[PDB]
Coordinates of C-alpha atoms and ligand atoms in Angstrom, one line a residue:
Chain A
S8 CA 9.5 8.5 25.6
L9 CA 7.2 7.3 27.5
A10 CA 5.8 5.2 24.3
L11 CA 9.1 3.1 24.4
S12 CA 8.4 2.2 28.1
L13 CA 5.2 0.4 27.6
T14 CA 5.1 -3.4 27.9
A15 CA 3.1 -4.9 25.2
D16 CA -0.1 -5.0 27.3
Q17 CA 0.2 -1.5 28.7
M18 CA 0.3 -1.0 24.9
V19 CA -3.0 -2.9 23.8
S20 CA -4.5 -0.7 27.0
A21 CA -3.8 2.2 25.9
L22 CA -5.1 1.8 22.3
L23 CA -8.3 0.0 23.3
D24 CA -8.9 2.7 25.6
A25 CA -8.4 5.6 23.0
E26 CA -11.0 3.5 20.6
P27 CA -13.2 6.5 19.1
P28 CA -16.9 5.6 19.5
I29 CA -19.4 4.3 16.4
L30 CA -21.0 7.0 15.3
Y31 CA -25.2 7.5 13.6
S32 CA -25.6 8.8 10.1
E33 CA -28.1 11.4 9.3
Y34 CA -30.0 9.1 7.5
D35 CA -33.8 9.5 6.8
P36 CA -35.9 6.8 5.3
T37 CA -38.2 9.0 3.9
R38 CA -36.5 9.3 0.2
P39 CA -34.7 7.4 -2.1
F40 CA -31.5 7.6 -2.2
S41 CA -30.0 9.5 -5.1
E42 CA -26.3 9.8 -5.8
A43 CA -26.1 13.2 -4.4
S44 CA -27.8 12.5 -1.1
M45 CA -25.9 9.3 -0.7
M46 CA -22.7 11.1 -0.7
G47 CA -24.0 13.6 1.4
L48 CA -24.6 11.2 4.1
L49 CA -21.0 9.3 3.7
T50 CA -19.5 12.9 3.8
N51 CA -21.6 14.0 6.9
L52 CA -20.8 10.5 8.8
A53 CA -17.0 11.5 7.5
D54 CA -16.6 14.6 8.8
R55 CA -17.9 13.7 12.4
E56 CA -15.1 10.5 12.2
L57 CA -12.6 12.9 11.2
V58 CA -13.0 15.1 14.3
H59 CA -12.9 11.9 16.5
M60 CA -9.7 10.2 14.5
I61 CA -8.1 14.0 15.4
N62 CA -8.4 13.4 19.3
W63 CA -7.7 9.6 18.9
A64 CA -4.4 10.3 16.9
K65 CA -3.0 12.2 19.8
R66 CA -4.0 9.1 22.4
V67 CA -1.5 7.0 20.0
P68 CA 1.5 6.3 21.7
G69 CA 4.1 9.0 20.9
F70 CA 2.6 10.6 18.4
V71 CA 2.0 13.3 20.5
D72 CA 6.2 13.5 20.6
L73 CA 6.1 14.7 16.7
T74 CA 6.1 18.5 15.9
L75 CA 2.5 19.9 14.9
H76 CA 3.7 19.9 11.7
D77 CA 4.6 15.9 11.6
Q78 CA 1.4 15.2 13.4
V79 CA -0.2 17.1 10.4
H80 CA 1.8 15.1 7.5
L81 CA 0.8 12.0 9.2
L82 CA -2.8 12.3 9.3
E83 CA -3.1 14.0 6.2
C84 CA -1.5 10.6 4.3
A85 CA -3.3 7.7 6.3
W86 CA -6.9 9.5 7.3
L87 CA -8.8 7.4 4.1
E88 CA -7.1 4.2 4.9
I89 CA -7.8 5.1 8.6
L90 CA -11.9 5.3 8.3
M91 CA -11.5 2.6 5.9
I92 CA -9.9 0.2 8.4
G93 CA -12.2 1.1 10.6
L94 CA -15.7 0.6 8.1
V95 CA -14.3 -3.0 7.8
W96 CA -13.6 -3.8 10.9
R97 CA -17.2 -2.9 12.4
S98 CA -18.3 -4.6 8.9
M99 CA -16.8 -7.8 9.6
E100 CA -20.0 -9.6 11.0
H101 CA -22.1 -8.5 8.5
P102 CA -21.0 -10.8 5.3
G103 CA -21.7 -8.8 2.2
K104 CA -22.6 -5.4 3.6
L105 CA -20.6 -2.5 4.9
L106 CA -21.8 -1.0 8.5
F107 CA -21.0 2.7 8.1
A108 CA -22.9 3.2 10.7
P109 CA -25.3 0.9 12.8
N110 CA -28.8 2.9 11.3
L111 CA -26.6 3.1 7.4
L112 CA -25.7 -1.0 6.9
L113 CA -25.5 -0.8 3.1
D114 CA -24.8 -3.7 0.6
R115 CA -23.0 -3.3 -2.9
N116 CA -26.4 -3.0 -4.9
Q117 CA -26.8 0.2 -3.0
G118 CA -23.3 1.3 -3.7
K119 CA -23.9 1.1 -7.2
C120 CA -26.4 4.4 -6.3
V121 CA -23.1 6.5 -6.5
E122 CA -20.9 6.5 -10.0
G123 CA -17.8 4.7 -9.3
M124 CA -18.1 3.6 -5.9
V125 CA -18.7 0.2 -6.0
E126 CA -15.6 -1.1 -7.3
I127 CA -14.2 0.0 -4.2
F128 CA -17.2 -0.9 -2.1
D129 CA -16.6 -4.3 -3.6
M130 CA -12.6 -4.0 -2.5
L131 CA -14.0 -3.5 1.1
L132 CA -16.2 -5.9 1.2
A133 CA -13.4 -8.5 0.4
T134 CA -11.4 -6.8 2.9
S135 CA -13.6 -7.2 5.8
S136 CA -14.2 -10.9 4.5
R137 CA -10.5 -11.6 5.0
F138 CA -10.6 -10.0 8.4
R139 CA -13.4 -12.7 9.1
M140 CA -11.7 -15.5 8.1
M141 CA -8.8 -14.9 9.8
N142 CA -11.0 -14.1 12.8
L143 CA -9.1 -11.2 13.4
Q144 CA -9.4 -9.6 17.0
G145 CA -10.1 -6.4 18.7
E146 CA -6.3 -6.1 20.1
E147 CA -4.7 -7.1 16.6
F148 CA -7.0 -4.5 14.8
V149 CA -6.1 -1.9 17.1
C150 CA -2.5 -2.3 16.4
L151 CA -3.1 -2.3 12.8
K152 CA -4.8 1.1 12.8
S153 CA -1.8 2.5 14.7
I154 CA 1.0 1.0 12.6
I155 CA -1.2 2.8 9.4
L156 CA -0.8 6.5 11.2
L157 CA 2.7 6.2 11.8
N158 CA 3.8 4.2 8.9
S159 CA 2.1 5.8 5.5
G160 CA 3.5 9.2 5.9
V161 CA 6.8 8.3 7.4
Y162 CA 8.1 7.9 3.9
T163 CA 7.2 11.7 3.0
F164 CA 8.8 13.4 5.4
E173 CA 15.5 11.9 14.2
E174 CA 11.8 12.5 13.8
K175 CA 11.6 9.3 11.8
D176 CA 13.7 7.2 14.1
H177 CA 11.2 8.2 16.7
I178 CA 8.8 6.7 14.5
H179 CA 10.4 3.6 14.0
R180 CA 11.2 3.0 17.6
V181 CA 6.9 2.9 18.3
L182 CA 6.7 1.0 15.4
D183 CA 9.2 -1.8 16.2
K184 CA 7.1 -1.8 19.9
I185 CA 3.4 -2.2 17.9
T186 CA 5.3 -5.3 16.0
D187 CA 6.3 -6.8 19.6
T188 CA 2.9 -5.9 20.6
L189 CA 1.2 -7.7 18.3
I190 CA 3.4 -10.8 18.2
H191 CA 3.2 -10.7 21.8
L192 CA -0.9 -10.8 21.3
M193 CA -0.4 -14.0 19.0
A194 CA 2.0 -16.0 20.8
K195 CA -0.4 -15.4 24.3
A196 CA -3.3 -16.9 21.7
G197 CA -1.2 -19.5 21.8
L198 CA -0.3 -19.8 18.1
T199 CA 3.1 -21.5 17.0
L200 CA 6.3 -19.6 16.7
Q201 CA 5.8 -20.0 12.5
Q202 CA 2.2 -19.1 12.8
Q203 CA 3.2 -16.0 14.5
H204 CA 5.5 -14.5 11.9
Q205 CA 3.3 -15.6 9.2
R206 CA 0.2 -14.1 11.1
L207 CA 1.9 -10.8 11.5
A208 CA 3.0 -11.0 7.3
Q209 CA -0.5 -11.9 6.8
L210 CA -1.9 -8.5 8.4
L211 CA 0.9 -6.3 7.1
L212 CA 0.4 -7.5 3.4
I213 CA -3.3 -6.3 4.1
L214 CA -2.1 -3.1 4.9
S215 CA -0.7 -3.0 1.1
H216 CA -4.6 -3.5 0.2
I217 CA -6.0 -0.5 2.3
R218 CA -3.4 1.6 0.9
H219 CA -4.8 0.9 -2.3
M220 CA -8.0 1.3 -1.5
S221 CA -7.5 4.5 0.1
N222 CA -5.2 5.9 -3.1
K223 CA -8.4 4.5 -5.4
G224 CA -10.7 6.3 -3.2
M225 CA -9.0 9.7 -2.9
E226 CA -9.6 9.4 -7.0
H227 CA -12.9 9.4 -7.1
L228 CA -13.4 12.0 -4.1
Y229 CA -11.3 14.3 -5.8
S230 CA -13.6 13.6 -9.1
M231 CA -16.9 14.1 -6.9
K232 CA -15.7 17.9 -5.3
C233 CA -14.3 19.3 -8.7
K234 CA -18.1 17.9 -9.9
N235 CA -19.6 19.7 -7.1
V236 CA -21.9 16.1 -6.3
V237 CA -21.9 17.4 -2.8
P238 CA -20.5 20.1 -0.2
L239 CA -17.5 19.1 1.5
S240 CA -16.7 20.6 4.9
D241 CA -13.4 22.7 4.7
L242 CA -11.6 19.8 7.1
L243 CA -12.1 17.3 4.2
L244 CA -11.1 19.9 2.0
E245 CA -8.0 20.2 3.0
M246 CA -7.7 16.5 3.9
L247 CA -8.6 15.3 0.0
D248 CA -6.5 18.8 -1.1
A249 CA -3.3 17.3 0.3
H250 CA -3.0 14.0 -1.9
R251 CA -3.0 16.7 -4.9
Chain B
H2 CA -3.5 28.2 9.1
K3 CA -5.0 24.5 8.3
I4 CA -8.3 23.5 10.2
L5 CA -5.8 20.4 10.9
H6 CA -3.5 22.4 12.5
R7 CA -5.8 24.2 14.9
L8 CA -8.0 20.8 15.8
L9 CA -4.6 19.0 16.9
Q10 CA -4.2 21.8 19.6
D11 CA -7.5 23.2 21.0
Chain C
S8 CA 2.3 -28.9 -5.1
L9 CA 5.8 -28.5 -5.8
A10 CA 6.3 -24.6 -4.4
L11 CA 5.3 -26.1 -0.9
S12 CA 8.1 -28.6 -0.6
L13 CA 10.4 -26.4 -1.4
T14 CA 13.0 -25.7 1.3
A15 CA 13.6 -22.2 2.5
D16 CA 17.4 -22.2 0.8
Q17 CA 15.8 -23.7 -2.1
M18 CA 13.2 -21.1 -2.5
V19 CA 16.2 -18.5 -2.2
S20 CA 18.3 -20.7 -4.7
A21 CA 14.6 -20.6 -7.3
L22 CA 14.2 -16.9 -6.8
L23 CA 18.0 -15.8 -7.3
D24 CA 18.0 -18.1 -10.9
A25 CA 14.9 -16.4 -12.0
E26 CA 16.0 -12.8 -11.4
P27 CA 15.4 -10.7 -14.5
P28 CA 18.5 -9.4 -16.2
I29 CA 19.8 -5.6 -16.1
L30 CA 19.1 -3.6 -19.4
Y31 CA 20.9 -0.7 -20.6
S32 CA 18.6 2.3 -22.0
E33 CA 19.5 3.8 -25.6
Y34 CA 20.7 7.4 -24.3
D35 CA 23.6 8.9 -25.8
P36 CA 24.7 12.3 -24.6
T37 CA 22.7 15.0 -26.5
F40 CA 17.4 15.9 -23.1
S41 CA 13.8 17.5 -23.7
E42 CA 10.9 16.2 -21.4
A43 CA 10.2 14.0 -24.5
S44 CA 13.6 12.7 -25.0
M45 CA 13.7 11.4 -21.3
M46 CA 10.4 10.0 -21.3
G47 CA 11.2 8.1 -24.4
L48 CA 14.1 6.7 -23.1
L49 CA 12.2 5.5 -19.8
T50 CA 9.0 3.9 -21.7
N51 CA 11.2 1.8 -24.3
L52 CA 13.0 1.0 -20.7
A53 CA 10.0 0.3 -18.8
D54 CA 8.8 -1.5 -22.3
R55 CA 11.7 -3.8 -22.3
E56 CA 11.5 -5.0 -19.1
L57 CA 8.2 -5.9 -19.0
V58 CA 9.0 -8.3 -21.2
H59 CA 11.7 -9.9 -19.0
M60 CA 9.1 -9.6 -16.0
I61 CA 6.8 -11.9 -17.5
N62 CA 9.3 -14.7 -18.1
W63 CA 10.4 -14.2 -14.3
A64 CA 7.1 -14.0 -12.8
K65 CA 6.7 -17.7 -14.5
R66 CA 9.4 -19.0 -12.9
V67 CA 8.3 -17.5 -9.6
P68 CA 7.3 -20.9 -7.7
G69 CA 3.7 -21.1 -7.3
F70 CA 3.2 -18.7 -10.1
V71 CA 2.6 -21.5 -13.2
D72 CA 0.0 -23.6 -11.0
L73 CA -2.7 -20.8 -11.0
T74 CA -5.2 -19.8 -14.1
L75 CA -3.9 -17.5 -17.1
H76 CA -6.5 -15.6 -16.0
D77 CA -5.2 -15.2 -12.4
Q78 CA -1.6 -14.9 -13.9
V79 CA -2.9 -12.0 -15.9
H80 CA -4.5 -10.1 -13.2
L81 CA -1.7 -10.5 -11.0
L82 CA 0.8 -8.9 -13.3
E83 CA -1.6 -6.5 -14.7
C84 CA -2.2 -5.3 -10.7
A85 CA 1.7 -5.6 -9.9
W86 CA 3.8 -4.7 -12.6
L87 CA 4.2 -0.9 -11.7
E88 CA 4.8 -1.9 -8.3
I89 CA 7.6 -4.6 -9.2
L90 CA 9.5 -2.3 -11.8
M91 CA 9.7 0.0 -8.9
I92 CA 11.1 -1.9 -6.5
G93 CA 13.5 -3.2 -9.0
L94 CA 14.4 0.5 -9.9
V95 CA 15.0 1.6 -6.1
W96 CA 17.0 -1.9 -5.3
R97 CA 19.3 -1.3 -7.7
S98 CA 19.5 2.2 -6.8
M99 CA 20.4 1.0 -3.4
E100 CA 24.6 2.5 -3.7
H101 CA 23.7 5.4 -5.1
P102 CA 22.5 8.2 -3.0
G103 CA 20.4 10.6 -4.4
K104 CA 20.4 8.9 -7.8
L105 CA 18.5 7.1 -9.3
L106 CA 19.6 3.6 -11.9
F107 CA 17.1 3.3 -14.3
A108 CA 20.3 1.7 -15.9
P109 CA 23.5 1.2 -15.9
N110 CA 24.1 4.0 -18.6
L111 CA 21.4 5.8 -17.1
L112 CA 21.6 7.3 -13.7
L113 CA 19.6 10.1 -12.9
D114 CA 19.2 12.8 -9.9
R115 CA 16.2 14.8 -9.2
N116 CA 16.9 17.4 -10.8
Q117 CA 17.1 15.4 -13.8
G118 CA 13.7 14.0 -13.0
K119 CA 12.1 17.6 -12.6
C120 CA 12.7 17.6 -16.6
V121 CA 9.7 15.7 -16.7
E122 CA 6.7 17.1 -15.6
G123 CA 5.0 15.9 -12.2
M124 CA 8.0 12.8 -11.7
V125 CA 10.3 14.4 -9.0
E126 CA 7.8 13.7 -6.3
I127 CA 7.3 10.4 -7.8
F128 CA 11.4 10.1 -8.1
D129 CA 11.3 11.7 -4.2
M130 CA 9.6 8.6 -3.3
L131 CA 11.3 6.3 -4.9
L132 CA 14.8 7.7 -3.7
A133 CA 13.4 7.8 0.1
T134 CA 12.4 4.6 -0.4
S135 CA 16.4 3.6 -2.1
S136 CA 17.6 5.7 1.1
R137 CA 15.3 3.4 3.6
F138 CA 16.2 0.2 1.8
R139 CA 20.2 1.3 2.4
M140 CA 19.7 1.6 5.9
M141 CA 18.3 -1.3 6.7
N142 CA 21.0 -2.9 4.6
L143 CA 18.4 -4.4 2.7
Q144 CA 20.3 -8.3 0.9
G145 CA 19.6 -9.5 -2.5
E146 CA 18.2 -12.4 -0.5
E147 CA 15.5 -10.5 1.1
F148 CA 15.2 -8.3 -2.0
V149 CA 13.7 -11.7 -4.1
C150 CA 11.4 -12.3 -1.5
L151 CA 10.0 -9.2 -1.4
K152 CA 9.7 -8.9 -5.0
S153 CA 7.7 -12.2 -5.4
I154 CA 5.7 -11.0 -2.6
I155 CA 5.0 -8.1 -4.1
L156 CA 3.6 -10.3 -7.6
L157 CA 1.8 -12.8 -5.6
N158 CA -0.1 -10.4 -2.9
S159 CA -0.9 -7.3 -5.0
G160 CA -3.9 -8.6 -6.4
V161 CA -4.8 -11.9 -4.8
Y162 CA -8.6 -10.7 -5.6
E173 CA -9.2 -21.9 -3.7
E174 CA -7.0 -20.0 -6.2
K175 CA -6.6 -17.8 -3.5
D176 CA -5.7 -20.1 -0.8
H177 CA -2.7 -21.5 -3.1
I178 CA -1.5 -18.2 -2.7
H179 CA -1.9 -17.8 0.6
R180 CA 0.1 -21.2 1.3
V181 CA 2.9 -19.7 -1.0
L182 CA 2.9 -16.3 0.6
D183 CA 3.1 -17.9 3.8
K184 CA 6.2 -20.1 2.1
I185 CA 7.8 -16.9 1.4
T186 CA 7.3 -15.2 5.1
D187 CA 9.3 -18.7 5.8
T188 CA 11.5 -17.8 3.8
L189 CA 12.8 -14.1 5.1
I190 CA 12.5 -15.2 8.6
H191 CA 15.1 -18.3 7.7
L192 CA 17.1 -15.4 5.9
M193 CA 17.1 -13.7 9.5
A194 CA 17.8 -15.9 11.8
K195 CA 20.7 -17.6 9.6
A196 CA 22.0 -13.5 9.7
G197 CA 22.4 -13.8 13.6
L198 CA 19.1 -11.9 14.4
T199 CA 17.4 -12.9 17.4
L200 CA 13.8 -13.9 17.2
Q201 CA 12.2 -10.4 18.5
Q202 CA 14.8 -8.2 15.7
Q203 CA 13.7 -11.3 13.0
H204 CA 9.7 -10.3 14.1
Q205 CA 10.6 -6.3 14.1
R206 CA 12.6 -6.3 10.3
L207 CA 10.1 -8.7 8.7
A208 CA 7.8 -5.9 10.0
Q209 CA 9.6 -3.0 8.6
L210 CA 10.2 -4.4 5.1
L211 CA 6.3 -5.6 4.8
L212 CA 5.4 -2.1 5.4
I213 CA 7.8 -0.7 3.1
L214 CA 5.4 -2.5 0.7
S215 CA 2.3 -0.1 1.8
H216 CA 5.0 3.1 0.2
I217 CA 5.8 0.6 -3.0
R218 CA 2.3 0.3 -3.6
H219 CA 1.7 4.0 -3.0
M220 CA 4.0 5.1 -5.4
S221 CA 2.8 2.6 -8.1
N222 CA -0.7 4.2 -7.7
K223 CA 0.2 7.8 -7.8
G224 CA 2.6 7.2 -10.8
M225 CA -0.1 4.9 -12.5
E226 CA -2.1 8.0 -12.1
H227 CA 0.7 10.1 -14.0
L228 CA 1.4 8.0 -16.9
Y229 CA -2.7 7.8 -17.8
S230 CA -2.2 11.6 -18.2
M231 CA 0.4 11.2 -20.3
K232 CA -1.2 8.1 -22.7
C233 CA -4.1 10.3 -23.3
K234 CA -1.8 13.7 -23.8
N235 CA 0.4 12.0 -26.6
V236 CA 3.4 13.1 -24.6
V237 CA 5.5 10.0 -26.1
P238 CA 4.4 6.8 -27.8
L239 CA 3.6 4.4 -25.1
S240 CA 4.1 0.7 -26.9
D241 CA 1.3 -1.6 -26.8
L242 CA 2.1 -3.8 -23.8
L243 CA 2.5 -0.7 -22.0
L244 CA -0.8 0.5 -23.0
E245 CA -2.7 -3.1 -22.2
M246 CA -1.2 -3.0 -18.9
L247 CA -2.3 0.6 -18.3
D248 CA -5.3 0.1 -19.5
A249 CA -6.2 -2.7 -17.0
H250 CA -5.9 0.3 -14.0
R251 CA -9.3 1.9 -15.2
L252 CA -11.1 -1.0 -15.9
Chain D
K3 CA -4.6 -9.4 -24.7
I4 CA -0.7 -9.3 -25.5
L5 CA -0.2 -10.2 -21.8
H6 CA -2.1 -13.2 -22.2
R7 CA 0.0 -14.0 -25.4
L8 CA 3.3 -13.7 -23.6
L9 CA 2.4 -15.5 -20.3
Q10 CA 1.7 -18.8 -23.1
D11 CA 4.7 -18.4 -24.8
Ligands
LIG301 C1 -17.5 7.5 5.9 C2 -16.9 6.3 5.0 C3 -17.1 6.2 3.6 C4 -16.3 5.3 2.8 C5 -17.0 5.3 1.4 C6 -16.8 6.2 0.9 C7 -16.4 7.1 1.3 C8 -17.9 8.1 0.2 C9 -18.0 9.6 0.6 C10 -16.7 10.2 1.1 O1 -16.6 12.0 1.2 C11 -15.9 9.4 1.9 C12 -14.8 10.0 2.9 C13 -15.5 8.1 1.5 C14 -16.8 5.8 -0.4 C15 -15.5 5.0 -0.9 S1 -14.0 6.3 -1.5 O2 -13.6 6.5 0.1 O3 -13.2 5.7 -1.9 O4 -14.6 7.7 -1.6 C16 -15.4 7.3 -2.7 C17 -16.6 8.2 -3.2 C18 -17.4 7.7 -4.5 C19 -17.0 6.8 -5.5 C20 -15.7 6.1 -5.0 C21 -14.8 6.2 -4.2 C22 -15.2 4.0 -0.1 C23 -16.4 4.2 1.2 S2 -17.8 4.0 -0.2 O5 -17.9 3.2 -0.9 C24 -15.1 4.4 3.5 C25 -15.1 4.8 5.2 C26 -15.4 5.8 6.0 O6 -15.8 5.8 7.1
LIG302 C1 11.9 2.4 -16.3 C2 11.2 2.2 -15.1 C3 10.7 3.7 -15.1 C4 10.3 3.9 -13.5 C5 9.6 5.0 -13.0 C6 8.9 6.4 -14.7 C7 8.6 5.6 -15.5 C8 8.8 6.7 -16.6 C9 7.9 6.3 -17.7 C10 7.3 4.8 -17.9 O1 6.8 4.6 -19.3 C11 7.6 4.2 -16.7 C12 6.9 3.1 -16.7 C13 7.8 4.6 -15.5 C14 8.5 7.1 -14.1 C15 7.8 7.6 -12.2 S1 6.0 6.5 -13.0 O2 6.6 5.1 -13.0 O3 5.4 7.2 -11.7 O4 5.8 7.2 -14.1 C16 5.6 8.7 -14.3 C17 6.1 9.6 -15.7 C18 5.7 11.2 -15.4 C19 5.6 11.7 -14.3 C20 5.4 10.9 -12.8 C21 5.4 9.2 -12.6 C22 9.2 6.6 -11.8 C23 10.7 6.2 -12.6 S2 10.6 8.0 -13.1 O5 10.3 8.5 -12.1 C24 10.1 3.4 -12.7 C25 10.5 2.1 -12.8 C26 11.4 1.9 -14.0 O6 11.8 0.5 -14.8

């Protein structure tokens, strides 16, 4: 497996190169926001992001070595976590705001337009604030996002052993980055733990979010793409 | 089958 | 503060001594969905009481406001119960040891509707711990991490200083076990990523448990109800 | 809340 034969610097480059672009929303500033119209905006955006995610996942070292069925499972489990970590990453330099898109930067007061959304909005803001405090680097971000993809669905499955070897290698890569950044040996393991523990809160935000998304569906608030419907149904 | 499944190929 | 002056060995020792006892259920060989749920609820309720006094013995926890202590427990209680369950189930492949006199396999978990999926996730976690050969000293560190980390939302800094201390402790345990540097970092990562799955299980289970509270399946205790209510608002 | 009481005593 070439995934395992990559050096740390090689891991970083591949992951950086695989990064998806930032997309714009179809935000139309001619009309006031409603619950439905904002959910419509976020849904459409998320759907276009999903297509890019799928192609990004294929470029995560080791991922294409898994059966089609395991690739499906991992993405079904992690998709929202992945959308969310990307959102908090690009919102980092926007304190108090979430940059859903360059043309869709929202504060919590706008988040309140959608029933039950502001609570999760608040958790996302706090995570972005946390990443900002830690001075999260791009190289570290792409490692975490890949860890989420490989880890979040591994416990619900040989194939599992392969996944853990890749994960170990991303750990090596994270430490490598931190040491190269000049952190002491102790600072390295402490920062590793801090970043990984944040993944627990990202899981939490995903689980909570999924509940509301399902709710919005069964309340016909907004039309969902068939892809989105399948991803949602996978969590039920 | 699933749309995800097909997308992971195309 | 005290928790920050503690050594790795002291931290380990403080946590070991703080461990709550293993409780029995009042089960007698006679098994409806209401029977099994009642035993588990009764059990969990009594475990909660011990957990609270255990939390107070976790270094640094008492330095926090009463308000923050409440928030951390409200957020983490089911995660703590679950990791407790998987730990003691380690040496019982395919079975969950809720209590010494209540050992259950997955087919029995099917007795309660929707419970088997959570059942299966807990089993896979226990199996994971078994394959990693999780040590008691590592387990107490992980459980304390869950308490302090899961809801950490001045106060946060103190919480983060303690968390770092516990990370140092975990690494100390591994270096002491003979693990190389690379192996220490890898094992630390592995253990911490498992907490993500433990969070996931708590969220899924909380979802079901509330579905039962409104269905009146079984009389959840007052304390349990308040713990469950905290995850709704 | 009960939890509050238990944390005190
Ligand atoms: C586009 C996008 C949106 C979001 C968020 C929400 C959202 C909205 C619509 C939608 O179709 C999807 C997939 C997500 C909402 C929430 S969610 O994922 O938990 O979904 C919710 C929708 C309504 C209420 C609560 C949650 C997080 C952020 S915004 O606060 C997060 C990341 C992201 O890339
Ligand atoms: C006693 C005890 C039970 C459990 C589990 C369940 C359970 C049961 C009753 C109850 O009052 C509580 C608090 C938990 C069930 C699940 S739960 O936490 O998700 O609660 C569920 C109850 C019914 C269906 C699904 C989940 C995990 C294990 S058993 O599979 C976990 C840890 C533990 O210490």
